[PDB]
């Protein structure tokens, strides 16, 4: 029924807690990768990208779900500070080559039959 087995967190609050030290670690992590990975973006240009994912992932309310991606974020952070990823992998977050996609209905109508 409603009773489900929680992963680590026991309600929203410490689920809200775990997203913090992920942000705590990510924020401390940005400037050294920009140096180590020889990135083209600025130190400022990394914090927003770290930031914008977080409230992009904001409609989520289930405590089990919240703890599930905080592990994925931790793993992504894990596979970043050992330079396991590469310049291309990190840059894939910046949708650079992909041209901007329209948003208004009229532009959708002009390009092709798609919602």
């Amino acid at each position: 029924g409603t009773s489900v087995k929680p992963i680590f967190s026991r309600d929203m609050n410490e689920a809200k807690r775990r997203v913090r030290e992920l942000y705590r670690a990510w924020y401390r992590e940005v400037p050294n990768t920009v140096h180590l990975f020889q990135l083209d973006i600025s130190v400022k240009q990394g914090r927003d990208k770290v930031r914008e994912m977080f409230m992009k992932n904001a409609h989520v309310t289930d405590p089990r779900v919240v703890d599930l991606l905080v592990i994925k974020g931790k793993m992504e952070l894990e596979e970043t500070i050992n330079v396991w990823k590469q310049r291309t992998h990190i840059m894939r977050f910046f949708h650079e080559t992909e041209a901007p996609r329209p948003t208004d209905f009229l532009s959708k109508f002009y390009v092709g039959h798609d919602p």
Partner: protein, 129 residues
């Protein structure tokens, strides 16, 4: 049943946060839950006993080099069989797809009688067998 700190979560299941479906393919795409129609040129009915969920069709343009059927919708050739309808739809909300449900069309029960082929007055006498 487990004594493993059973929290009573109530919010409806939504794993769209994790499946990784890109933003375009999660909201805009509409899935249809239906029982496949019996192929009319056949007669067997084995293919109409499992609910199937399929996604809407998108653009199909011909490749310039050689005439192809190139598309750019990954969720095109993806059907999923389901035992019962409520179990099929439970997948849709869980994956947050705007669903459309049909109903299980089944052949209505007919009454066949070989004696009718030769009646005395009823106008159902078959002209030739």
């Amino acid at each position: 049943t487990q004594d493993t700190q059973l929290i009573a979560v109530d919010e409806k299941l939504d794993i769209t946060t994790l499946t990784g479906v890109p933003e375009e393919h999660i909201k805009t795409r509409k899935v249809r839950i239906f029982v496949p129609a019996r192929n009319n040129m056949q007669s067997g009915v084995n293919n109409t006993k499992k609910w199937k969920m399929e996604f809407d069709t998108r653009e199909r343009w011909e490749n310039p080099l050689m005439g192809w059927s190139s598309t750019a919708d990954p969720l095109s050739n993806l059907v999923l069989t389901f035992s019962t309808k409520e179990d099929a739809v439970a997948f849709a909300e869980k994956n947050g797809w705007s669903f459309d449900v049909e109903e299980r069309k089944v052949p209505k029960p007919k009454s066949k009688s070989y004696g009718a082929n030769f009646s005395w007055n009823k106008r159902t006498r078959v002209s030739t067998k």
